[PDB]
């Protein structure tokens, strides 16, 4: 058993982290007070769920998590919320004033004054691990803290934990639920300085989560709570292999091995199905073929793009519920004869499949309906470069006029870092085209 430490940075990271650990507790039978009746080893144990929860002599199961925000109002919700008893105060770190959607303010000005404290708290969690695997870092692209302080934290993590893997869960900016105009700047600034420090990053576009909530859940105007409960379901699917007995993606290292043959191209596309409204009269349960076929529908992807016009480098099918390998292969065969699935010639045309018999857990009173089976597909498609193109375009429109640049320079950043980061994204976009296009 090897521990994983989760780090949540900024508003988006914290609130999403809140929805994930809520879900983790319901999955592992942990109560809000931290007690776990099914855990017969009191005060310790090296079970699969122990990679995310430590244990005290009093039988409390404590998440291996750190929450960080340069402003306290969001993390104050955790301190007084339902799961206030899960975390001890050392794990919840807050400043007094935020980064104001300003990468430079979160990276340089405020980051410099709080970085050593954060590492000290992370060091405390690491000291409790007998074999730390690495970190899962939740953050947004657009926020000043999520973008600016995460990139600094990732740099230091590579210094203090050189041999440790680091995976990201990043929120790609969407104007329908965003009030910051400079998020393209922040997204590209943070991807530039983080790229070499992240081994595998799962981008979630708020635009996609938003439309899934409107289309499948019949939420006219979705909220952050609606978005985050759905995001935590996808996150749960991805991290389930680390928290349950299994043989696929059993450690963080296996994510890079199974999903990233080329280091810079480490952004797998996530696809999830089925998302059914709990307000429905009653739904006809979907089969293995129907939910699998849905994994190739753009409407169910975490990032809207067209894999038909990219090339695949890896593909994992993570099933939860009543699924036997027989029905999986039968659905894949049928999908090959009907779908456009082009792999890169230097990669095998195959699928790594994981099945967890326990069907997806749903938060009581939430929006999702209880389904007998579900799947999350992780595929490394060059088509996800469409998201980089969109983002780079908005960057170019504003930077051509130097719009808003004075805010970043005023925080001690040099203007040259803008074009330095933009040139890195141009290289990233070129790598995708070399691998996917002919």
């Amino acid at each position: 058993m090897r521990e994983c430490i989760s780090i949540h940075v900024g508003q988006a990271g914290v609130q999403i982290g809140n929805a994930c650990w809520e879900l983790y507790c319901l999955e592992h039978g942990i109560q809000p007070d931290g007690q776990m009746p099914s855990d017969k080893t009191i005060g310790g144990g090296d079970d699969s769920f122990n990679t995310f929860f430590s244990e005290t002599g009093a039988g409390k199961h404590v998440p291996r998590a750190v929450f960080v925000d340069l402003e306290p109002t969001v993390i104050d919700e955790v301190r007084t919320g339902t799961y206030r008893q899960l975390f001890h105060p050392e794990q919840l770190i807050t400043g007094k004033e935020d980064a104001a959607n300003n990468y430079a303010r979160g990276h340089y000005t405020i980051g410099k004054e709080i970085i050593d404290l954060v590492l000290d708290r992370i060091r405390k969690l690491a000291d409790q691990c007998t074999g730390l695997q690495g970190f899962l870092v939740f953050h947004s692209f657009g926020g000043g803290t999520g973008s600016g302080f995460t990139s600094l934290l990732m740099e230091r993590l590579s210094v203090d934990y050189g041999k440790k893997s680091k995976l990201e869960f990043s929120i790609y900016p969407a104007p329908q639920v965003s009030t910051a105009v400079v998020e393209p700047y922040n997204s590209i600034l943070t991807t530039h300085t983080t790229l070499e420090h992240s081994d595998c990053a799962f981008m979630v576009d708020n635009e996609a989560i938003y439309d899934i909530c409107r289309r499948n859940l019949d939420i006219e105007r979705p909220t952050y709570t609606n978005l985050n409960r759905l995001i935590s379901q996808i996150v749960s699917s991805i991290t389930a292999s680390l928290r349950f007995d299994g043989a696929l993606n059993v450690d963080l290292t296996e994510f890079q091995t199974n999903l990233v043959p080329y280091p810079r191209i480490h952004f797998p596309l996530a696809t999830y199905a089925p998302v059914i409204s709990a307000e429905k009269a009653y739904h006809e349960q979907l089969s293995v073929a129907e939910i699998t076929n849905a994994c190739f529908e753009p409407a169910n992807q975490m990032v809207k793009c067209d894999p038909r016009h990219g090339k695949y480098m890896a593909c994992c099918l993570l099933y939860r519920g009543d699924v036997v390998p027989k029905d999986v292969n039968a659905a894949i065969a049928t999908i090959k004869t009907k779908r456009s699935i082009q792999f890169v010639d230097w990669c095998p045309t195959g699928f790594k499949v994981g099945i967890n018999y326990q069907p997806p857990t749903v938060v009581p009173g939430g929006d999702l309906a209880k389904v007998q089976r579900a799947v999350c597909m992780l595929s490394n498609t060059t088509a996800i470069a469409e998201a980089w193109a969109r983002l780079d375009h908005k960057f170019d429109l504003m930077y051509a006029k130097r719009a808003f640049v004075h805010w970043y320079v005023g925080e001690g950043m040099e203007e040259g870092e803008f074009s330095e980061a933009r040139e890195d994204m141009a290289a990233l976009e070129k790598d995708y085209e070399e691998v996917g296009v002919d």
Partner: protein
């Protein structure tokens, strides 16, 4: 606990500041004696942004009243909510400023400024985390204009990294007290261009035309004008005074509104503006149409004469947030020629469940439009008409000022106009 320190200077500044605290004190359930008597926790959620909490659960505004004559501040103290202000926060002289920027900035004002900064310091020293300052003043007089910008300059020196915000009433010949108002306004704009992050430009002519043409007030008074500014000030600060994510921070609002440091002069707008057919329900489409109509804007600049760099829109009341997004997306998509295309998604919408007193729902408009240059063009033309003949300059040279100082302020304001014009193309 993100406290804002409020300052109101001069006659116009204090009379408008008074109505402002009167309007928001009502929204937050604070009576004239500072006691809370509301029925919603949303009222006190962010109450400490503008109010200090004294003994006995009393809420005292964090406001500093400044003037060079006692008259106006005597009225405030004798006014409805006069008891609500901290008595020590009344800082005033006796000489007056004679509608003379030089007197407020160099001679009379310079004698009183240190004692005002002593009150500013005492208020800041209690703030858990001071966001910044907001000043309400006019630019056409002597105290608000001259001493106001003096206080800003001295506040920048002592708090260089805090946000500086102002509500500035621009003079107009149609609603004028003295002929020297263009002189005082050009001198103030010179200061404002350099020393504020955000300035809400409020043109007394727009407020007049609105009271006469739209509100059907035969003979508008300063009180009538101030009612509009009260409603506008309450609207543009809703993001700060209640729980929200759009522009909940003064610095965050500036980051999303100010693409270039010198272009931070906004056109505020409000809807509805109904004349006494006043009970009729206003639909979200109507709220949006009016909020973007020039007739509902208070800078007296036709937006169709320029382009929006950024736009902030706050909707108040229980309404269809889905229908809000649609109508907002309808305005942009139906007039995208008036929005610069090199700032993607430059229109941000915020919603607040608590409506203003006596309104089912309303909308407040904050625009950073290049059309504001027309406001500075008017002032520049009035300025030059007198300055070419050196008319009325002796009032200023008598206080130790040189003509060179006038020439530099004028040149800077014309530069400001040229910058608005280059981004308009």
């Amino acid at each position: 606990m993100r406290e804002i320190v409020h300052i109101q200077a001069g006659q116009c500044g204090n009379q408008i500041g008074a109505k402002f605290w009167e309007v928001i004190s009502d929204e937050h359930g604070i009576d004239p004696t500072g006691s809370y008597h509301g029925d919603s926790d949303l009222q006190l959620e962010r109450i400490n942004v503008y109010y200090n909490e004294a003994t006995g659960n009393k809420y005292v505004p964090r406001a500093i009243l400044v003037d060079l004559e006692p008259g106006t501040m005597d009225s405030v103290r004798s006014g409805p909510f006069g008891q609500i202000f901290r008595p020590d926060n009344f800082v005033f002289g006796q000489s007056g400023a004679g509608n003379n920027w030089a007197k407020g900035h160099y001679t009379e004002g310079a004698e009183l400024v240190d004692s005002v900064l002593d009150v500013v310091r005492k208020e800041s020293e209690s703030c858990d985390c001071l966001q910044g300052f907001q000043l309400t003043h006019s630019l056409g007089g002597g105290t608000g204009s001259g001493m106001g910008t003096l206080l800003i300059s001295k506040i920048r020196e002592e708090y260089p990294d805090r946000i500086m915000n102002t509500f500035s009433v621009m003079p107009s010949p149609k609603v004028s007290d003295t002929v020297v108002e263009p002189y005082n306004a050009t001198l103030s704009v010179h200061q404002l261009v350099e020393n504020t992050d955000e300035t809400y430009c409020i043109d007394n002519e727009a407020l007049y035309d609105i009271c006469f043409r739209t509100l059907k007030l035969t003979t508008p008074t300063y009180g009538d004008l101030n009612h509009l500014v009260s409603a506008t000030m309450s609207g543009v600060t809703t993001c700060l005074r209640f729980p929200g994510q759009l522009n909940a921070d003064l610095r965050k609002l500036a980051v999303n509104m100010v693409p270039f440091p010198r272009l931070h002069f906004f056109m505020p707008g409000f809807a509805p503006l109904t004349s006494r057919q006043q009970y009729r329900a206003l639909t979200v489409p109507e709220l949006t149409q009016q909020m973007f109509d020039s007739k509902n804007m208070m800078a007296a600049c036709d937006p169709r004469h320029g382009r929006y760099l950024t736009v902030a829109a706050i909707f108040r009341g229980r309404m269809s947030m889905k229908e809000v997004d649609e109508q907002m997306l309808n305005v942009q998509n139906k007039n995208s020629s008036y929005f610069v295309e090199w700032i993607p998604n430059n229109v941000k919408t915020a919603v607040c469940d608590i409506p203003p007193r006596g309104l089912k729902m309303s909308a407040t408009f904050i625009g950073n439009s290049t059309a504001i240059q027309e406001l500075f063009k008017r002032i520049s033309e009035q300025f030059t008409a007198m300055f070419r003949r050196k008319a009325f300059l002796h009032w200023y040279t008598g206080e130790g000022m040189d003509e060179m100082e006038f020439t530099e302020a004028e040149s800077n304001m014309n530069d400001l106009v040229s910058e608005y014009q280059q981004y308009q193309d």
